[PDB]
Design a protein around this ligand. Sequence first.
Ligand SMILES: [Cl-]
Ligand SMILES: [Cl-]
Ligand SMILES: [Cl-]
Ligand SMILES: [Cl-]
Ligand SMILES: [Cl-]
Ligand SMILES: [Zn+2]
Ligand SMILES: [Zn+2]
Lengths: 361, 365
Amino acid sequence: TGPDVSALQLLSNSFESVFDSPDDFYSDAKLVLSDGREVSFHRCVLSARSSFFKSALAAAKKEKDAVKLELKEIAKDYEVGFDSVVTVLAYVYSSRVRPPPKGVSECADENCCHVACRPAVDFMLEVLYLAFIFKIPELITLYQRHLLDVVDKVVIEDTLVILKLANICGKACMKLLDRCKEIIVKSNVDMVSLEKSLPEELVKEIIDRRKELGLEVPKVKKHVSNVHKALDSDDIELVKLLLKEDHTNLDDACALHFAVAYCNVKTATDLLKLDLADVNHRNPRGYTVLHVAAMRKEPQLILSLLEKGASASEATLEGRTALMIAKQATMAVECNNIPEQCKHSLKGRLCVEILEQEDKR
Amino acid sequence: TGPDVSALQLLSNSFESVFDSPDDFYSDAKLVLSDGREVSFHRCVLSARSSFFKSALAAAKKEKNNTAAVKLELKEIAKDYEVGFDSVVTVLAYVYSSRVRPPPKGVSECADENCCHVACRPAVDFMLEVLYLAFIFKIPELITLYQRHLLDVVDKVVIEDTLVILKLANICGKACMKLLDRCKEIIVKSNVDMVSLEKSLPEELVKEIIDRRKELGLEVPKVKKHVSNVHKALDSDDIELVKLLLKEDHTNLDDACALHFAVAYCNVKTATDLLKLDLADVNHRNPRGYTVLHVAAMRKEPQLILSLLEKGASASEATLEGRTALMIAKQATMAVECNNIPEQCKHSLKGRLCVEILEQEDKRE
Ligand SMILES: [Cl-]
Ligand SMILES: [Cl-]
Ligand SMILES: [Cl-]
Ligand SMILES: [Cl-]
Ligand SMILES: [Cl-]
Ligand SMILES: [Zn+2]
Ligand SMILES: [Zn+2]
């Protein structure tokens, strides 16, 4: 006849119990991440559920090598976390989508619903990349559906990273890739943002589609490009010599935004120590220098900007202030009950505390 | 809100493909049967699904390391009921994919083309083997499933097979209370001889059945003393003692069903000699309602059938349920034993021989 659900759920529960304690059920392989942590797993289960692991295990058994697999070697184009791998392996074992622990897929804004904020998008990106590398089509489709449902609410700067990973996944994520391309074309993303966030192929494709649809594709000023290249090389004296000609201004070139977004901390610091640019100036996307400083999560940049008269009460076109951006850019792990817990870099927490201080000031 | 059926079905399909090709997915253990065949299985799957396998593998890993070096002897951990290979395959398929797999036709099927193979002996034997495997492996879902399978059928099974079903139900402990109680009720309701109970069931089971038969008002006749002497002389294979007991004129082989006893439970040569004495009616019917030819067909020994026919055995007689000796020999033998493929794991061919002898005798009406 058809399917018997009771036996299927019993099988799923037994295999999930196997995954929960793999050492009590004769685990014979280990998957080591790029950080240093490792997860124990069994060769048969993952050789059956995924073709990638079957091929990798058949290749590893040919050298007569307890088998360890470096995740940083097989999947090389995206640094995946630990909880994403745990979720993917839980689905591999029990056919059940295990939810992530609180904090990983959640930001530091208690007002944020954690649906479209950056930590959740990053977790979904990691899980989708893992499902693509492991060649699990159901997980691929499910998480592509998730990102397609949420992408209309995520900010454009994160949609750029979503488009990047969608192109990384090739033809397996056609829907998400085309949707992100359409969203980026319809929006007013700077050419510098596209150049520094996307490979040359994507930039050329988006520019061709923008010029084909008759959209606004303005060229870059040559002298402004010279100032940008001078800033990218950390040559402040070159910026001084370029400004001596008075052909360009740091406000019309958004040199502060560029230095805060992409350049080094010391380069932006030395550029600010000259005082030849409006600190509260905006950009074609509507962000001020403090907003980009919040997006970068560098405490010294925010501090030096506040010591220069940066107004922190100004909002973006979407209604987000610098504190909101800083909270929604950091995950909740870095701001909760003060345990050790990997720690990562407490730079985002420092930025959040700086901006919360400036709030009540 | 609800279980995901597609993901669970894909999981079951993947693990069924694992079971169908264990060596392709790094099998690390081998279950060897009593005959000598091997089934390659993985330790993790059976340690998860079966608590028995987990407890056994935790102790087996104490001693033991090269290439697929873990072996489990089924003849030792079972050691209470000889289990075939197809039933083990079915149980392992349910362990891996959580779905029941029907055995190849012939294991649970008899050689009678008119039989529906619902209650014949091969089907009952396969059900009992799978039930015993589920009991030993500690799987309650399979236990209940096959208990219900046997319970729905037991009312249409011949009582002599109900004896074996009750034996297994007693073996399987309290995990088959319904089956055991129903089988005990069926046995005490019928008029099964005390000798058959003694030779087919343990002492405590026979004592319980006799106690309930006595307390329920049903008659339990006293075992005739001299008949017991004849039965004991036949069981020890002393035809001279049987001759001495018959020389006292106090006994009669027909009144004791000595031919039935010798054909059912004694050796071939003892029954042959007792038949050569020519001191008993060959077509005599026992209290159960069977003739000596029916008992010979149940025993599946061709020499006894030939010696019976050469002595005057009528093959056209039927039992209480309407079965002739040919139909009994058909429904008692597996269908694979009479197939057009003798190299399919050779088995005793005495059943096919008896069936064909009775078919040839039936052709000369
Ligand atoms: Cl809250
Ligand atoms: Cl809000
Ligand atoms: Cl929200
Ligand atoms: Cl962001
Ligand atoms: Cl059997
Ligand atoms: Zn959030
Ligand atoms: Zn049958």
